[PDB]
Amino acid sequence: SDRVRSITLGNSTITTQECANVVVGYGVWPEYLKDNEATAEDQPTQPDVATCRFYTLESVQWMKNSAGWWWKLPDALSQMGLFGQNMQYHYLGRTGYTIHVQCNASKFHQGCLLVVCVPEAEMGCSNLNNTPEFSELSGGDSARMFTDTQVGESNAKKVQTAVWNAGMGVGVGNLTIFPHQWINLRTNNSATLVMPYINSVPMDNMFRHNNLTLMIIPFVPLNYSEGSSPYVPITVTIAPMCAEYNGLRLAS
Amino acid sequence: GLPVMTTPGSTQFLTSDDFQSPSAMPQFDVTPEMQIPGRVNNLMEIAEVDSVVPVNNTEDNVSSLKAYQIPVQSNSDNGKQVFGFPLQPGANNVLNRTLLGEILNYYTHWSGSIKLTFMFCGSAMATGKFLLAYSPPGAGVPKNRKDAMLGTHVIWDVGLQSSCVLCVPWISQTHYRYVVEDEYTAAGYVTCWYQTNIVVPADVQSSCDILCFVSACNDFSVRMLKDTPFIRQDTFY
Amino acid sequence: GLPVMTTPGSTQFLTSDDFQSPSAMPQFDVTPEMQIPGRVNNLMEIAEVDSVVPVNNTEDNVSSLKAYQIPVQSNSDNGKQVFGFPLQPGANNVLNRTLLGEILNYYTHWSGSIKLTFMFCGSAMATGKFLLAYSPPGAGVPKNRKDAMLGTHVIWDVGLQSSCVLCVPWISQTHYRYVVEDEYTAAGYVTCWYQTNIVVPADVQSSCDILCFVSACNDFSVRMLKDTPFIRQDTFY
Amino acid sequence: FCGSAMATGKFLLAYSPPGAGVPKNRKDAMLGTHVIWDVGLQSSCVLCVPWISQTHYRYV
Amino acid sequence: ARVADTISSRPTNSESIPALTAAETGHTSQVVPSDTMQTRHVKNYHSRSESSIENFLCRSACVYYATYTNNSKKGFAEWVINTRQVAQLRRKLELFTYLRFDLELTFVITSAQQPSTASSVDAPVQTHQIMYVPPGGPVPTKVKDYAWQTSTNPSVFWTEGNAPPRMSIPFISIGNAYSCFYDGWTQFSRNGVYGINTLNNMGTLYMRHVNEAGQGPIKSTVRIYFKPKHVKAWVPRPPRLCQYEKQKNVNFSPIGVTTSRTDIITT
Amino acid sequence: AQVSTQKTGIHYTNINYYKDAASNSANRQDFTQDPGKFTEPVKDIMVKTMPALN
Amino acid sequence: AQVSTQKTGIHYTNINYYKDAASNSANRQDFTQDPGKFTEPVKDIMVKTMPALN
Amino acid sequence: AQVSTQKTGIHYTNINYYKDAASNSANRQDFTQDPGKFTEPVKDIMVKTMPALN
Ligand SMILES: CCCCCCCCCCCCCCCC(=O)O
């Protein structure tokens, strides 16, 4: 039976009784930096049980007229435990991730979700001259949501959040070129993606650069009949993997 | 003074030449290479990845997520058609904009098989059986399930495994086909019919949906690189 | 008559080419070579030599020898700052004109560590302890000795040996850095504070001075040679 | 889980060592030692409280 | 790079199910058409040689063109080097996230006669100079300037009526690859410039006439062509749907996913 | 002097003239394929004839 | 004909055509370092870990 | 380098410079004859000295 997993990281454990396979990045598992690729020449810090564990974000409600949600990935964990405290005292850092999206409903509900992970998901603005400001591009472990309409040009600094363009000007059906899974309420209950470190430099600052984006888009909308449960949540759980830091300084 | 003689084709700029040229910055030390995940060596690795197909254009679903959903009901008769489109992976507006149909619009010739995957995104208590057919050209489009069963078909039974693959084989008189629309190199039609009904229990919604995917097999190839007609410009940005 | 064909790039004068040319004075006897002391083979041997740094610009000390002296007193409190400047070896006007900062203004990229040597030119009966810190970017400039001790520091005790070296390590996300001012490739700040006081006997002057030196380590390198912005011309001389 | 065979659910079973108070949110309780229980065909789950103490024994 | 060939097959009645799968795993099915029907043995001789990254990207494409006039005060041209002002090369390079290549540079220079007023206008052959200034150096402010001494900046000279000038450029970068997309700011306070403009620092290219304005004005035009060699590519990307609007950012106006038809059963 | 194989459906000669490796010609003959890192990026391998979920 | 090593981050061929040695190309590949004659021009050698004055 | 025979009524040298086989010169020296498929396309062979019909 392929339907059961068990993931153990630190002092936390996930158990699943209804699951698909585990998608591993681009075939690569996360690992520490080697001596041939290093450029910063002082010794890095590896706490490795205090940071590499499962942190759970907030929950969102899947409604019937629901369009989608997104998260910027080294930003939702910026106030979570000892992971968000090492980011404030250090200048560099590199991390791999393990994402577990989970949503349960009965055999009398239907719907489908696409869970992708997009590296360098640069987004656009509703006014054609400006760029979006920081408060709309991300939130502290709170979802920013798409909408089925088009944001007008009368606003100045807001993200263009039409779902069929995916915020980036591309087709939403072609997002399956990135590592992804589906959640089908007929057969599935969760989705698990393992992502390595992807950048053009061996280390980077985690406060000026978001290098991953997790999107959850309902392709088939949620439907049920009269009498069934109307409230269906979605919960996301992220665990850092093989994290290390460089450049101690003041607290920023 | 060695005696030489210059041929036609001298002092010309052919934009696809293969020559050596002197470097403008001599003795430069480039940054050493790093192992970044996800290296692309061939463009055919991109085209062999599934992509959702918008079969439901219908004049007002294109600015919506409803273009990707195929409606499925419970009927009072038998043998109705679900969808149907001609197999033109670079000229027909259904398969035009997908991940396979964008690589083909950079080339002129194509050859190989095509996979079509269908997923049933309905309730876990609903059943059904479908017919996924392919008809080579020479006749028209099949108008019944009696005419569509004479071609190449598969019967899909919806159960615990929620997907099925209809693998369109390479049936052609030539070795390659044109990407642009051409009646000499047509490829045929792909249809879908009801085999039995969608039987549903009480307190379950009858209307379900089906998603569609498309990709390429491992014998697919392309030829004669050209420009794409999918971009414009008026002035410099 | 061998058949040849001429490519683009013919009859052009690229100023950094590498070709052979016929000699205008054939069969010339040059003067034999002599052993002159002090042969330079690489420009990095020039940049690895100490040079006095003008930390004391302050709007009227630039046309004087007072720009090189750092004032040091005996205080009535604790934890005061001596100096501070950002680490930009080719764009900041403190390290701009030194022996290291003039070779860097001929290039575009640089990489490696930087040495900073401090000498106490006071009386032989005066004491003191200092703190020499370095702070990577990401936060601002440290405003206390409590904030500056969290970075990379050394505590210098002034005794018989009158010099100390603070070796700024290479902490960067990339392999190279820009010589011109750039917020994407910033390098941080270098500060100095009082650890304890300058305690002096009677009939000795309290006010002392400190000199500063700068050089490069043995992993320093440069790239992408360009022109310097430190010279003008209007007409021929 | 002694419920009906058509009902689903996921829970969080946490343990918090002393030093701070009692966690008042799910955000505070996920920082300790937890397991996420998915209710399916297997109807039981075990949360094994480890021995975290400064001494070798404890008072009853 | 030959493709796989077809294997003959037989009628089956068994437990194995090649056609049934689960697309919920994020895993594309590996079925061949010799599993769903009866096939014959066919030896394929087709090759995938024309779709390589070395063959898809190694062609010359125009990136800019600028004009400058002889009889003009401060008549010369400048250009800050980027690959985002044209629509055809920008869509080809943005199928990937990270790229690493060498370069080949080619210039095409023309000239035109302006409506002068003198009689017996006859001009000699024109000579042009194209100068490259790396970031930080001194820039020209006029035509008769000291900055055209090109002591260490690389430049090129060319006389009209010959083969076009050409030179090579290595992989000049500070990182380990070029970046087509940057999701972040340049300040640590998260203000100001957001996007790919924080990574673009390549220099400026200057153009002028070396001759003097004899008796009639002359207006020239240069054209610049890029050709990537020795290409590596990572992390592919969906192609762009909407039309480009600006150069510095990725702002767009929303558009439909395809064009429409009149029914779902319309062939 | 390098002697290579000259793609058909016969050899040729190639000599390098410059001192820098950025001055050479294009590669054009490096045919290498690895489609499995995009099409099957899963942890446990999946046999085609077996069902996906047991 | 000289065959050299063609700086990278592969070989090339070089033949001389003229009778004078001032007609050749530039050297460009003579990497030699001696920084000690400028940085440590002292009489008695100084060990790094020992103090300078005893 | 190919050395061929240079049609007379003496040799020459030929080197290929490009990577594609469509860039070569013309063949011009492939002399092959098979006139029997047009002049005698019959089933049973016919001897010249014998009559055609017996
Ligand atoms: C006469 C000599 C001219 C020298 C011209 C050198 C031009 C440098 C080329 C830079 C390549 C730019 C590649 C794209 C940059 C990016 O995408 O971020």
Side-chain angles (χ1 to χ4, degrees), chain B residues 24-25, chain C residues 14 224, chain E residues 81-84 93 101 103 105 107 130-132 154-156 167-170 172 178-180 196 199-203 205 226:
Chain B
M25 303 169 199
Chain C
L14 187 58
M224 203 150 177
Chain E
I81 300 174
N82 68 319
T83 54
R84 280 169 208 97
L93 289 182
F101 46 84
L103 212 61
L105 201 47
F107 302 94
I130 300 165
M131 199 193 192
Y132 173 60
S155 52
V156 71
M167 66 223 64
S168 280
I169 294 96
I172 48 167
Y178 292 118
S179 200
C180 315
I196 203 57
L199 299 203
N200 194 238
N201 218 16
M202 311 281 160
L205 208 66
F226 269 21

Side-chain angles (χ1 to χ4, degrees), chain E residues 176-197:
Chain E
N176 291 254
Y178 292 118
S179 200
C180 315
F181 294 88
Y182 184 69
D183 188 19
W185 296 263
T186 172
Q187 311 189 3
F188 295 95
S189 48
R190 305 201 220 85
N191 290 321
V193 179
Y194 165 73
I196 203 57
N197 199 86

Side-chain angles (χ1 to χ4, degrees), chain B residues 71-86:
Chain B
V72 157
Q73 293 89 21
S74 281
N75 319 102
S76 298
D77 53 343
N78 38 39
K80 271 178 54 61
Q81 198 178 0
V82 186
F83 62 90
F85 53 89

Side-chain angles (χ1 to χ4, degrees), chain B:
Chain B
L2 170 76
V4 296
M5 197 206 77
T6 77
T7 69
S10 307
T11 71
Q12 65 159 6
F13 176 42
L14 187 58
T15 66
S16 45
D17 61 351
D18 198 278
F19 294 135
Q20 311 186 39
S21 60
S23 185
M25 303 169 199
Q27 305 300 309
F28 197 84
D29 191 357
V30 301
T31 322
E33 215 184 319
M34 191 180 71
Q35 283 275 326
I36 319 185
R39 187 172 164 186
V40 197
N41 277 302
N42 196 358
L43 275 189
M44 308 312 296
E45 307 162 349
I46 299 176
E48 289 170 6
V49 173
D50 274 26
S51 194
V52 195
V53 183
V55 203
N56 202 15
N57 315 134
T58 70
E59 308 151 351
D60 50 271
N61 294 326
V62 286
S63 276
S64 159
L65 271 186
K66 262 187 161 188
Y68 301 97
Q69 305 162 13
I70 304 173
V72 157
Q73 293 89 21
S74 281
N75 319 102
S76 298
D77 53 343
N78 38 39
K80 271 178 54 61
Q81 198 178 0
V82 186
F83 62 90
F85 53 89
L87 194 70
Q88 288 159 342
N92 197 44
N93 55 1
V94 171
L95 306 167
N96 201 2
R97 186 59 72 183
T98 55
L99 214 46
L100 169 69
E102 284 271 20
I103 285 179
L104 290 178
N105 275 278
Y106 278 103
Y107 292 92
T108 321
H109 306 144
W110 70 275
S111 163
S113 299
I114 282 172
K115 268 183 294 197
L116 270 163
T117 315
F118 308 90
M119 193 168 71
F120 185 71
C121 321
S123 163
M125 305 291 293
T127 63
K129 298 198 189 203
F130 300 96
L131 184 67
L132 317 159
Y134 166 65
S135 316
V141 199
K143 314 144 196 170
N144 322 309
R145 201 165 46 88
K146 190 144 283 176
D147 284 349
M149 77 176 186
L150 294 164
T152 299
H153 58 101
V154 66
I155 294 197
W156 173 30
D157 183 31
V158 191
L160 258 65
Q161 317 272 270
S162 42
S163 294
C164 197
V165 194
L166 165 81
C167 201
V168 174
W170 179 248
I171 303 177
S172 184
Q173 65 200 5
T174 59
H175 284 266
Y176 279 90
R177 272 194 169 118
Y178 278 126
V179 161
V180 80
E181 200 186 327
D182 204 89
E183 199 158 56
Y184 181 71
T185 48
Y189 309 91
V190 170
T191 43
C192 185
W193 308 82
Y194 282 92
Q195 190 80 11
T196 62
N197 214 23
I198 303 294
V199 190
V200 82
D203 311 303
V204 194
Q205 292 272 2
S206 317
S207 311
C208 297
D209 283 316
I210 296 181
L211 297 184
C212 198
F213 300 91
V214 76
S215 89
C217 280
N218 56 338
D219 57 346
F220 209 88
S221 44
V222 285
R223 222 167 71 162
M224 203 150 177
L225 167 70
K226 63 151 180 67
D227 263 334
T228 190
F230 287 146
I231 199 67
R232 227 61 50 200
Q233 209 179 351
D234 289 345
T235 299
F236 285 123
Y237 301 136

